[PDB]
């Protein structure tokens, strides 16, 4: 009786895992180091670096062990992967409602400006120093749109059981994302105003930072996924991460188009 040696539920069993407790400890370390570095206390340089390397090691090892368990033990049943997809969707909805905070912050700071602002949301003297709608950021937006198109092409070709086409599409997407990051860094260096300069600069910088870190997360996800593909650990139906990344990238692109609509059209 084969079922006798087996359990009766398709849900995974995990034990040990010292990763969560030490991850909490290292996060506390990072928080303390950041708080100390805010006030400029001495010997606050190597502390932050050591804490960040510890955090990197701990969640990298957590991810490696989780992927291994999802690979060898084969606990990726239909119910488990469905629940993982619903959890990822719930997380991205939470991210949308997090970004809504900064969206309403900009809306409130813009619709009713203070009486020292000259009765115009664009600051007097700085209004002519704003970002024109037609410049390098528009090129970056078109690059991102073409990157999404290429990524969708690669995903469909991968559905068609194709290695070369999907891999080339992924390579083009990675290169386009890297050049987008370089262009964003260039625009950051050539920023007309600092974050501390009025509320316009602060809101712009806050809005751009979250998108930047989310795009960094997307790039690390893409490079990891191409690592698994090269390592020959991805199959036709054992591909939850691919669809998760695709959905996340489309979500982030939609958020980016909304930002491009508001900040660089209404504010200029």
């Amino acid at each position: 009786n084969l079922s006798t040696k087996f359990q009766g539920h398709p849900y995974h069993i995990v034990s040990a895992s010292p990763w969560p407790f030490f991850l909490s400890v290292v996060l506390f370390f990072n928080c303390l180091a950041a708080t100390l570095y805010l006030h400029g206390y001495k010997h606050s340089s190597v502390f932050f670096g050591i804490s960040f390397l510890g955090l990197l090691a701990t969640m990298y090892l957590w991810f490696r062990d989780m992927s291994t368990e999802a690979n060898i033990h084969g606990a990726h049943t239909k119910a488990v992967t469905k629940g993982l997809k619903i959890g990822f969707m719930l997380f991205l909805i939470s991210e949308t409602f997090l970004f809504a905070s900064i969206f309403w912050a900009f809306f409130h700071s813009s619709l009713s400006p203070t009486f020292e602002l000259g009765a115009v949301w664009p600051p007097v003297g700085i209004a002519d120093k704003t970002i024109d709608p037609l410049e390098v950021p528009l090129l970056n937006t078109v690059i991102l749109l073409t990157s999404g198109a290429s990524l969708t092409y690669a995903h469909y070709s991968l559905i068609a059981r194709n290695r070369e086409n999907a891999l080339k599409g992924l390579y083009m997407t990675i290169a386009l994302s890297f050049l987008f990051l370089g262009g964003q860094a260039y625009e950051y260096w050539n920023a007309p105003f600092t974050i501390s300069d009025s509320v316009y600069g602060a809101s712009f910088y806050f809005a751009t930072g979250l998108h930047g870190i989310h795009i960094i997360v997307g790039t690390i996800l893409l490079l990891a996924a191409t690592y698994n593909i090269y390592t020959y650990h991805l199959t036709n139906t054992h591909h939850n991460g691919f669809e998760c990344g695709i959905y996340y990238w489309h979500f982030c692109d939609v958020v980016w188009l909304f930002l491009y609509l508001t900040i660089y059209i209404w504010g200029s």
Partner: protein, 121 residues
């Protein structure tokens, strides 16, 4: 399918459930690159049977001593629930059925005899 069914029938220990493996230079398929309990689940679902029991019981055939309603039980204790007559008869109360004993419904009077598709030890 039929060959996969023969493979499912021909097994000795869980250590023998493996996948043949794919071919380099092309994306493989789950039929050759599966391992662990996912392989067991896919073979069980293609074979036509169920890996585990997930069959909700039926509210008809009101219980009788001669012919009790049969309940699948991988365990000697197989907790169930009774609605009685077709849905809406009475509130849902939970019951436990021990080894080969009869549990009668305290509102409808329905007995659920138990079996065991496995060696006790």
């Amino acid at each position: 399918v039929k060959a996969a069914a023969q493979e499912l029938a021909n097994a000795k220990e869980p250590s023998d459930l493996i996948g043949p493996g794919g071919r380099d230079g092309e994306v493989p398929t789950d039929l050759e690159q599966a391992t662990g309990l996912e392989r067991y689940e896919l073979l069980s679902e293609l074979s036509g049977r169920d890996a585990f029991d997930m069959k909700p019981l039926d509210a008809s055939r009101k219980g009788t001593l001669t012919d009790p309603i049969m309940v699948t039980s991988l365990d000697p204790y197989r907790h169930i629930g009774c609605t009685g007559s077709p849905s809406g008869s009475h509130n849902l109360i939970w019951m436990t059925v021990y080894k080969d004993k009869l549990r009668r419904c305290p509102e409808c009077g329905s007995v659920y005899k138990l079996k065991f598709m496995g060696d006790p030890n």
